[PDB]
Design a protein around this ligand. Structure first.
Ligand SMILES: *[B@@]([O])(O[C][C][O])C1=[C]C(O[C])=[C][C]=[C]1
Ligand SMILES: [Cl-]
Length: 363
């Protein structure tokens, strides 16, 4: 019958439409993987000025959702024995020898517990090898490595950069030439080709100023991916079924499904952040709140790494000045969701859309 497709469209419309109006979002793409089949719902405008509509092939900036791609490359380096999570960071970059990175592990970098590396590189550090080198050489922890989580682009960005060094090639090259092709992603870019630029949505900020992300230190590792809802759902489907990939890449994906510690309701993996499922909307919003991004939290370390599978929701938010992304999946239900928008609108609102869709699918 037409009832299932009508019901899914009604459910997704009902979740999305009020949140778009309420947050003045110009364009938004949803992709859902349900019972092994993809479903796409596209809303509004990729560019207000030329009237280009959002489609499942429109490219959006996904911001820190990029960290899950970075984690997958590190997973590859790890499961290929080029590095280990307990290595000291300075083992992989001689410039860091003699610095405080002699006493910081790769796991600490990956999971934001190196001792207070900040949210962003300071404005004084430009996209320049020498400036980045000098920044890390001089940095000193605020508190003991392994004790407090402070969400940090320099932290996980260094993790990704060191993973690339361990493999003997630049990060960006490894992503384009190995990771994206291994995952079957042809609409996923760190540097959008000229021929694909017509697909790149405009981002919108205050007063609807146009905003596309500019160069920054370790931008590729931290926040550099542009992709379509269709490709990001393919990445979600790879996460739901790593066994469908060639074994080295299956192992790399599996490495991102391991939890190391908890903060509140959240279990931290490499890239992915996990919750028990079901959990309340308010709790999932709280785990994705501004204090979780901006404030340090003492960790509760697990006795051994924990498999992030079964009745769990794995997620990641991502933001740039002009864009707001959210991805969530439930391994034990073969369910995945992607929500990409061209405004940076509050995380709580992204989670509201997702939760309405997931709730509705449960009924
Ligand atoms: B990232 O998007 O995380 C925020 C949403 O959870 C992020 C992006 C940065 O620059 C664009 C810097 C830090 C984190
Ligand atoms: Cl940064």
């Amino acid at each position: 019958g037409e009832a299932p497709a009508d019901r899914l469209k009604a459910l997704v419309d009902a979740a999305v439409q009020p949140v778009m109006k309420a947050n003045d979002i110009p364009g938004l793409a949803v992709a859902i993987s349900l019972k092994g089949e993809p479903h796409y719902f596209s809303y509004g405008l990729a560019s207000k000025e030329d009237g280009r509509r959002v489609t499942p092939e429109t490219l959006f900036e996904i911001g820190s959702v990029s960290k899950t791609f970075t984690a997958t490359l590190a997973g590859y380096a790890l499961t290929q024995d080029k590095m280990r999570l307990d290595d000291r960071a300075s083992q992989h970059w001689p410039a860091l020898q003699g610095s405080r990175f002699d006493g910081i592990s790769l796991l600490d970098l990956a999971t934001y517990t190196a001792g207070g590396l900040p949210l962003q590189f300071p404005d004084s550090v430009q996209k320049d090898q020498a400036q980045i080198r000098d920044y890390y050489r001089q940095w000193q922890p605020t508190y003991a490595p392994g004790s407090q989580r402070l969400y940090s682009n320099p932290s996980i960005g260094l993790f990704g950069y060191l993973a690339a060094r361990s493999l003997g090639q630049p990060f960006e090259r490894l992503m384009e030439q190995q990771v994206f092709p291994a995952l079957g992603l042809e609409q996923t870019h760190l540097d959008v080709p000229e021929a694909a630029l017509a697909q790149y949505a405009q981002g919108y900020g205050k007063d609807d100023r146009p905003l596309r992300v500019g160069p920054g230190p370790l931008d590729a590792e931290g926040y550099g991916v542009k992709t379509s809802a269709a490709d990001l759902l393919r990445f979600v489907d790879a996460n739901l079924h790593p066994e469908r990939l060639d074994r080295p890449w299956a192992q790399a994906l599996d490495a991102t499904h391991r939890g190391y510690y908890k903060v509140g309701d959240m279990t931290q993996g490499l890239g992915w952040e996990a919750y028990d499922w079901p959990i309340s909307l308010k709790r999932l919003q709280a785990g994705n709140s501004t204090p979780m991004a901006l404030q340090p939290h003492r960790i509760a370390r697990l006795p051994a790494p924990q498999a992030l599978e079964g009745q769990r929701l794995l997620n990641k938010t991502g933001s740039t000045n002009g864009f707001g992304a959210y991805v969530a999946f439930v391994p034990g239900r073969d369910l995945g969701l992607v929500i990409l928008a061209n405004r940076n609108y509050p995380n709580a609102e992204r989670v509201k859309i997702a939760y309405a869709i997931l709730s509705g699918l449960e009924q």
